[PDB]
């Protein structure tokens, strides 16, 4: 039976932009999506 899975974390800024400060400035205008994505992956990770 499978009990657990890999606990992974993603950095939204490195993935979406990556060594591009101008992109990071544009990303903020989008919103709190990074915060919810980290909250989601952190809950999956503590459950595991």
């Amino acid at each position: 039976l499978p009990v657990s899975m890999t606990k992974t974390s993603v950095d939204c800024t490195m993935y979406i932009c990556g060594d591009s400060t101008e992109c990071s400035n544009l990303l903020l205008q989008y919103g709190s999506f990074c915060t919810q994505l980290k909250r989601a992956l952190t809950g999956i990770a503590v459950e595991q």
Partner: protein
């Protein structure tokens, strides 16, 4: 200013309870900058003009 203050700001609260909170990201920043192309080699004939 402090490690704890980042935890207070992340939780949006003035009290933080016991635990590990992922406050931020650590990135080493580029130090010098090096640009390397192949040897200049051939120079054309402006000299002949």
């Amino acid at each position: 200013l402090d490690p704890l203050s980042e935890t207070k700001c992340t939780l949006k609260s003035f009290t933080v309870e016991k635990g590990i909170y992922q406050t931020s990201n650590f990135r080493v920043q580029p130090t010098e900058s090096i640009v390397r192309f192949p040897n200049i080699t051939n120079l054309c004939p402006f000299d002949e003009v």
